[PDB]
Design a protein around this ligand. Structure first.
Ligand SMILES: *[C@@](O)(C(=O)NCc1ccccc1)[C@H](C[C@H]1CCNC1=O)NC(=O)[C@H](CC1CC1)n1cccc(NC(=O)OC(C)(C)C)c1=O
Ligand SMILES: *[C@@](O)(C(=O)NCc1ccccc1)[C@H](C[C@H]1CCNC1=O)NC(=O)[C@H](CC1CC1)n1cccc(NC(=O)OC(C)(C)C)c1=O
Lengths: 302, 302
């Protein structure tokens, strides 16, 4: 009963957050086994930020002046292997709270929970999605850098996101944990295109399959359409093309619900050209597209 | 940058969740020091649920047949003091993870995070509010009972909510941790009025003060009104009266922002009669009222 934007419990990650300081900039790190992960630009001294030289700093910079803190427990630094845009510090102590964990790259449309931190301490958790343009609509301030996004797969923490920067439109770009940016972004202060964002067609459908479940079923209509026609409706309405995979994934829902994906497709396109008239689906006057088919199911079976 | 519905980190509570079984019903408990808290109707055997006798069960029921589990660690039961609608079991072991913690009653309009659990294990966290009618719009299924709502005050966990039941409209009622229901609700299967819910005027204002901050400022208008006139606008639009306290709390925002509360009041009432034309404030086509003035500030200063 009810249907909410809902993040994974943050406990298993909370135990991995630490502070990382270097001169003028302190930001967050992730303490996994005997290594700690942070955005490499922890070594930038502003100035550098206009167009930096992360080769001609990394090796030229020394362990000692990297102040790692695990609350107070000032972790004893060792290594400094740089992977892309992450800086990985091996440390004398290994994490006793280290959860069963994993580094993963997510595709656009997938969601994760974000645990937003400052000075190595968490302030809160929210769920967002990798946008088609490879941005995320998150909530970050000064010091949020190194904050991480994650899924939990039973007792297993899949880490997908580390936060690096804000983009023109108050949206956010960051890397995976092997330090490669989502989207064509660099850690530098240049004019970077956000990109024109599509709506995640499948996620909006899965949302309506969550509605009908939770009794709200008014939007429903007396028509149907084709996977082709639909798509060309999508296009003027900046909806990602819908694909056979997308259909085959909306099955397990469309199944239980009765309603076949292609009716919901018409039920949807009706809403797209018509307006919403100021009525609301699951307490929203807008089409929500940050819920994966999967997201729905876990919030309808623990 | 950005603005999200955001829950407190769940770590400190996760360590307090346990399973509580009695015959046909297993649900969640809260393990604080050497006592564990759960909804008293863990002892109901259906049937009872039509109109129960929690006097003529509590004492008549025996410790041993209460199966408390802390993961596997089958906690050794002792006590059975019943406070209102909670059943409090003292146990041989005290919680080493017991956080600095506190039992508190929240007023309508205030928010808390919910950590929704099944079989004593958490599935996710979301933020919701005590609705004026004393309901909450949450996301709960079978086994969610005993799930708790909370705020965190630095290292201090204020517990406000324990979940008991669903109401007509797919909304939720539950107690404080001293076992007294929010609203006029009872743990029994009778026809219970949800109640007609107002919109939390102050929270909707604090939301707009969060908008302007995060650059979205279009809604803004060329007028003003009075605290009186406004209120009588509120009334047809089911907005709670606005009060001097409500004003004095929107200060610290209205301050930093420049804009004085009474302009935003006109800026608001314009939106109320006019429609939203299908444009959006902070990625919402509806007036959001589950953000306290406080909620905004912490998400603009860690
Ligand atoms: C990180 O938090 C960070 O790298 N800085 C940590 C810090 C900052 C102040 C004091 C102590 C520690 C931020 C993300 C923050 C910034 C404001 N809101 C956030 O979400 N990342 C950056 O500052 C980032 C660094 C880049 C090398 C990778 N960055 C630098 C310069 C300019 C921008 N963006 C910006 O203002 O441009 C737009 C596109 C107009 C928004 C930037 O993100
Ligand atoms: C709790 O989870 C619970 O008490 N039951 C735990 C349980 C259930 C099945 C198997 C194992 C353990 C639920 C809350 C759940 C129920 C479905 N969605 C939820 O949020 N609470 C109740 O079941 C509650 C117990 C009352 C004594 C306090 N309860 C009982 C009967 C009827 C209702 N509500 C209902 O269906 O009525 C409405 C108003 C039409 C919705 C109820 O909530």
């Amino acid at each position: 009963s009810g249907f909410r934007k809902m993040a994974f419990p943050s406990g298993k990650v909370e135990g991995c957050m630490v502070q990382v300081t270097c001169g003028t900039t302190t930001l967050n790190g992730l303490w996994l086994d005997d290594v700690v992960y942070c955005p490499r630009h922890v070594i930038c001294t502003s100035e550098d930020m206009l167009n930096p030289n992360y080769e001609d700093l990394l090796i030229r910079k020394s362990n000692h002046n990297f102040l790692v803190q695990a609350g107070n427990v000032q972790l004893r630094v060792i290594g400094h292997s740089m992977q892309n845009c992450v800086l990985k510090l091996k440390v004398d102590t290994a994490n006793p709270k280290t959860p069963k964990y994993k580094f993963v790259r997510i595709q656009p449309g997938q969601t994760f929970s974000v645990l937003a931190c400052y000075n190595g301490s968490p302030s809160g958790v929210y769920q967002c999605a990798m946008r088609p343009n490879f941005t995320i609509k998150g909530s970050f301030l000064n010091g949020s850098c190194g904050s991480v996004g994650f899924n939990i797969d039973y007792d297993c923490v899949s880490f997908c996101y580390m936060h690096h920067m804000v983009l023109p439109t108050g949206v956010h770009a960051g890397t995976d944990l092997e330090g490669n940016f989502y989207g064509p972004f660099v850690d530098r202060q240049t004019a970077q295109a956000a990109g024109t964002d599509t709506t995640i067609t499948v996620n909006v459908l899965a949302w309506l399959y969550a509605a009908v479940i939770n009794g709200d079923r008014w939007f429903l209509n007396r028509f149907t359409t084709t996977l082709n026609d639909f798509n060309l409706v999508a296009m003027k309405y900046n909806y990602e093309p819908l694909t056979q995979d997308h259909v085959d994934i909306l099955g397990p829902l469309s199944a239980q619900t009765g309603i076949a994906v292609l009716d919901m497709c018409a039920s949807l396109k009706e809403l797209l050209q018509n307006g919403m008239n100021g009525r609301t689906i699951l307490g929203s006057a807008l089409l929500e597209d940050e819920f994966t088919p999967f997201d729905v199911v876990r919030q309808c079976s623990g």
